[PDB]
Nucleic acid binder design. Structure first.
Lengths: 97, 210, 126, 78, 100, 156, 60, 116
RNA sequence: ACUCGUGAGAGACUGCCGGGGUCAACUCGGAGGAAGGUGGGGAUGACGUCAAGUCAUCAUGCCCCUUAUGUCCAGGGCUUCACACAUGCUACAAUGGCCGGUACAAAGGGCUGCGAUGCCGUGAGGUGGAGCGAAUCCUUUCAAAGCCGGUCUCAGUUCGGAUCGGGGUCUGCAACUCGACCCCGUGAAGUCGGAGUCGCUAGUAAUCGCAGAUCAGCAACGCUGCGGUGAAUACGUUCCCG
């Protein structure tokens, strides 16, 4: 098995990217698990929004990390070539485990 | 005073895209540092040239630096002579290799950053400031298709001692509406008496385009 | 059969239909040994007392989240919507008494510049 | 108590001082250790930043780090 | 009568200490109700081919609750004089107004 | 929610063991904060000690003490023109039950029994006979109301 | 944020306790974050300009 | 009862009755009463003089008490006040020794308040 | 199949019925419905004010230093203390303390990091490395207040932990001035707090733990968040404040 776990910042780009992976492996023909949402991680960073003394009146900046999963069973190298062949959005990093 | 949040940072989730785009775990502080030194390296000669936008896409450690400007011809002088010099210095300052894409905006008077460029560069050049504000406007409203127009100039206007803010507009510029597609640009004039910070809001349209 | 999901503050409970002489299965425990407070004991059996099928209905439940009382109020909700899922003409009699309606009251967000949510730092102007 | 701190510059100097059986006033930077009882009898000019204070080392000094036989702050109040 | 004297951004001359003591000391005269006084001395206008605007703030916990009181003037002594005139009238009002 | 009119109040469930609005309301006014379960153990234990010292229904003893502390008139506060006037006003039912339970709990809390259960038991019993300090606070409140009857006219 | 200190916090120190963060863009010594390497002011201005990838203004 | 030198009260449990000596707190009571064998729940009225014997010989033998700790603590504080330490200076001036806050608090070392 | 995780979608519009409305807006009740009338909370600060804040985040006009007002290092200081204020935390006990047994969370964090079973300690921890770049491994299967039981009998106490002495562990080149944590002892003030004054209208107040950022270590009782248990009252605008 080749299990692809892809992470990104956009849910739209990771959904169309997962559509590219499902359309790719499904196009070459294999047994493939569809896109599974692993949930998130959020990094919340509270910033005192003042150059000088105003400890109250903050603004806090979050950080969304979207995690999608596609599990690949029964790999054939004509399918494995198209994995390293094209990645379209490139804001997505793909873990191959 | 006016506690107005930067609207490109107020709609950066909804309408306006990020300028820099990648994914980074445990490489992020390095990508930040390279992003900063790249934008400092693209400040000077491109601010002579007419720079508006500096996007950095970043693939598997190549890099892709893309610039939206208002004159392909000052950014690209002799082919490779003006392009590949700043490109090559981006290749040496970063520990990477640079694919520099350079492209023109269809209307320079449409972008709020370039309006702030032309206004503040006129205001360093000893022209009348109310005449300058009026020049940038009116013509901008028609140019392509804008609905909003807010030009605020603070600082030593005309070389006076008091720091008088000015406020000219035309049309509709709603900031609290999030389906606004507002371009925002503040650029700061450099006179001998000081610096005249110019803010320009440009409201293109109602269109979500979701 | 007929399951269900009852959602209180951050708790959640899952029950299922079943006909039998009185039994109550929580997470491996009995109802009198999982809820030792005897007031939540009313707070969950009150939908059974309204449409009076207190003994003629036994089913097991599994839960998650909350504390004691969030799981109690959640299990009230899941019994109630289960009693929709037994007989729909029990449904106007539940909703009339104050039932079938989960309480949307949750612990609200703490606000910056405050000790808690809705609590200012106590300020003595001079 | 794996190994207590030793002041290697003062350690080298102290050994030389006691091998020759010579006693000399020492202008010492070190506020950090009175490590061995080999330091007994040697006069230490402790440096609180601003001047050097002579300190005699006796048997009771073992276990007190060297700097604060000389204090760094001055207070009277009136 | 506990008298705390802070700057804001300013020297605090021995003339300012003594004068502060004597104006504010008027209040010790006739308002026995006093406790703590907190006195804080701002200095802007300065640096601008113009005359410095002083500001004095004074805090006063009476015996009971908390007065505050704020004054802006071209100089410091005239400002603290004025501030004590205001405070004296107020307090006797908070003395005043009552007595059936 | 004042100055907009009357605000809607939360409905209060009755007691499981005893079956009364007034028992549960006594529990929610026993609740030194956080521990409603421990408030229920104090109220329940105190009312079974009242069951021991009466041999009757405890809620009848509770409502008889609640009746014997319940006030009818309360004084207040309006200062017409430079003089503070104690003004007597008719007390609503919920206001009277609130003053009865709140006085009962607080002056049980001043009383010198060992635990809280013996305090609340002895205060419900002494308020049932009429010998607690809380009944003396009812008589002092009607003392201030009847002593200040004339100022009540304002119709306020 | 003097260039002797901006430059001195980037060399190899003679002890490992001596190496501190010091925000890269301006050189601000206090209130520096580790994931960004930016102080709170450069985080706020750069995150407002969309320059940092995917940190955005929060509301839950 | 009577013991090492502390007059025991009328009605206290043993793990509290041992605590009223200068060298013994709660944990030493839980270890002494485990080593010797006296029940911790025993009152002082119900205490046996042979239990005073075995308990007394144990806690004067393998542990120190009133005179040893008062002369030892006193001799160590005056030890560091004779040699000239900075903690000696803190015990001299009547200041907190651990280098803690002296500007507002540390009133338990300065003591009762005089206000100027 | 049930959750749950994250994608798309439906759903609250005075839409439906009754009454007031100038037959207008809108308001009082009812039904359906998970929710009823801006359902709850956020993010969102108009024109301007206050010469408010910041030339120490940064940028900068002008003036000043350039053999120092630059810069490199050791040591010291920013932690001093007769005081006064300010925000917090622990309390003054029985709705409590201490010992034993037992049940339920949410969110988070992790590479020269998080580090398990096992073994050595009384305990901080030591030895060791399973396993994890993590819905998986680790933070124990996660809590504490809760419940069941025993003891304490109102006392300056089995309340309270400040202080001080001895003895340690860990981090670091280095814990003296100046770190935290653990063990033994020590055992002070404090009996609900004058004038006053502050917060809060429902999952709120109150109380209970948990995580995070900064960080080798920590002055964290701070800050930002997460959930647990969970009240009272609002007659009403005369009075104080805006």
């Amino acid at each position: 098995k080749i299990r692809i776990r892809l992470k990104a910042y956009d849910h739209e780009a990771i959904d169309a990217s997962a559509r590219k992976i499902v359309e790719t492996v499904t196009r070459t023909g294999a047994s493939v698990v569809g896109p599974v949402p692993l949930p998130t991680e959020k990094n919340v960073y509270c910033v005192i929004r003042s150059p000088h003394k105003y400890k109250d009146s903050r603004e806090h900046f979050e950080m969304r990390t979207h995690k999608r999963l596609i599990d690949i069973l029964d790999p054939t190298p004509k399918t494995v070539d198209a994995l390293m062949r094209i990645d379209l959005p490139a804001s997505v990093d793909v873990n191959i485990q | 005073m006016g506690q107005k949040i930067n609207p490109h940072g107020f709609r950066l989730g909804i309408t306006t895209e990020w300028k820099s785009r990648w994914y980074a775990d445990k490489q992020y502080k390095d990508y930040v540092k390279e992003d900063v030194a790249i934008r400092k390296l693209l400040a000077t000669g491109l601010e002579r040239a007419g720079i508006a936008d500096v996007e950095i896409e970043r693939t598997r450690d190549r890099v892709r630096v893309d610039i939206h400007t208002a004159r392909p011809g000052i950014v690209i002088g002799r082919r490779g002579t003006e392009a590949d010099r700043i490109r090559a210095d981006l290749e040496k300052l970063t520990g990477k290799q640079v694919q520099l894409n350079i492209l023109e905006v269809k209307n320079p008077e449409s972008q709020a950053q370039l309006v702030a460029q032309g206004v503040a560069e006129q205001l360093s050049n000893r022209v009348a400031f109310r005449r300058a504000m009026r020049k940038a406007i009116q013509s901008a409203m028609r140019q392509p298709n804008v609905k909003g127009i807010r030009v605020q100039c603070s600082g030593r206007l005309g070389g006076a001692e008091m720091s008088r803010s000015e406020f000219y507009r035309e049309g509709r510029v709603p900031l609290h509406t999030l389906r606004a597609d507002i371009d925002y640009g503040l650029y700061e004039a450099k006179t001998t008496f000081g610096r005249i910070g110019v803010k320009v809001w440009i409201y293109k349209g109602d269109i979500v385009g979701g | 059969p007929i399951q269900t999901v009852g959602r209180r503050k951050e708790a959640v409970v899952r029950v299922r239909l079943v006909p039998g002489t009185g039994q109550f299965n929580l997470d491996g425990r009995t109802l009198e040994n999982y809820f030792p407070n005897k007031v939540h004991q009313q707070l969950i059996k009150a939908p059974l007392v309204t449409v009076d099928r207190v003994d003629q209905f036994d089913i097991y439940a599994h839960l998650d989240g909350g504390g004691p009382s969030g799981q109690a109020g959640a299990l009230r909700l899941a019994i109630a919507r289960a009693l929709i899922l037994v007989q729909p003409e029990d449904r106007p009699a539940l909703k009339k008494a104050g039932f079938l309606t989960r309480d949307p009251r949750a612990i609200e967000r703490k606000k910056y510049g405050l000790k808690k949510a809705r609590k200012a730092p106590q300020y003595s102007k001079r | 108590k794996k190994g207590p701190f030793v002041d290697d510059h003062l350690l080298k100097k102290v050994d030389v001082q006691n091998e020759k059986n010579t006693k000399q006033v020492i202008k010492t930077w070190s506020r950090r250790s009175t490590i061995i009882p080999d330091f007994i009898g040697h006069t230490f000019a402790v440096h609180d930043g601003r001047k050097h204070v002579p300190v005699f080392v006796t048997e009771a000094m073992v276990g007190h780090k060297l700097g604060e036989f000389a204090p760094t702050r001055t207070f009277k109040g009136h | 009568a506990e008298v705390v004297v802070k700057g804001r951004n300013v020297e605090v001359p021995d003339h300012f200490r003594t004068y502060v003591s004597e104006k504010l000391s008027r209040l010790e005269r006739f308002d026995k109700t006093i406790y703590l006084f907190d006195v804080e001395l701002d200095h802007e206008r300065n640096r601008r081919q113009r005359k410095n605007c002083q500001h004095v703030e004074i805090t006063a916990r009476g015996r009971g609750p908390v007065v505050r009181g704020e004054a802006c003037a071209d100089s410091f002594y005239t400002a603290f004089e004025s501030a004590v005139q205001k405070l004296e009238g107020r307090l006797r009002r908070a003395k005043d107004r009552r007595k059936i | 929610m004042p100055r907009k009119g009357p605000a809607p109040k939360r409905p209060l469930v009755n007691d499981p063991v005893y079956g009364s609005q007034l028992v549960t309301q006594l529990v929610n006014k026993v609740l030194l904060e956080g521990k409603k379960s421990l408030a229920e153990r104090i109220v329940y234990g105190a009312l079974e000690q009242a069951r021991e010292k009466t041999g009757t229904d405890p809620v009848v003893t509770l409502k008889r003490a609640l009746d014997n502390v319940k006030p009818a008139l309360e004084v207040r506060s309006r200062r017409v023109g430079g003089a503070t006037y104690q003004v007597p006003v008719e007390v609503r039912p919920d206001r009277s039950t609130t003053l009865a339970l709140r006085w009962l709990v607080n002056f049980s809390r001043q009383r010198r029994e060992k635990t809280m259960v013996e305090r609340l038991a002895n205060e419900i019993l002494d308020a049932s006979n009429g010998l607690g300090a809380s009944v003396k606070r009812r008589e002092d409140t009607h003392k201030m109301a009847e002593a200040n009857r004339a100022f009540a006219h304002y119709r306020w | 944020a003097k260039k002797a200190l901006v430059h001195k916090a980037n060399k190899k120190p003679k002890f490992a306790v001596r190496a501190y963060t010091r925000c890269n863009k301006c050189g601000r010594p206090h209130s520096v974050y580790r994931k960004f390497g930016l102080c709170r002011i450069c985080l706020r201005e750069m995150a407002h300009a969309g320059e940092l990838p995917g940190v955005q203004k929060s509301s839950w | 009862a009577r013991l090492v030198g502390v007059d025991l009260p009328r009605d206290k449990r043993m793990e509290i009755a041992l605590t009223y000596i200068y060298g013994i707190g709660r944990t030493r009571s839980n270890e002494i009463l485990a080593a010797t064998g006296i029940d911790k729940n025993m009152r002082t009225k119900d205490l046996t003089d042979d239990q005073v014997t075995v308990l007394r010989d144990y806690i004067e033998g393998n542990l120190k008490v009133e005179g040893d700790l008062r002369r030892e603590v006193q001799a160590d504080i005056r030890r560091k006040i004779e040699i000239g330490c900075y903690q000696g200076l803190r015990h001299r001036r009547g200041l907190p020794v651990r280098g803690q806050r002296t500007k507002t608090n540390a009133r338990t070392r300065k003591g009762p308040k005089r206000t100027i």
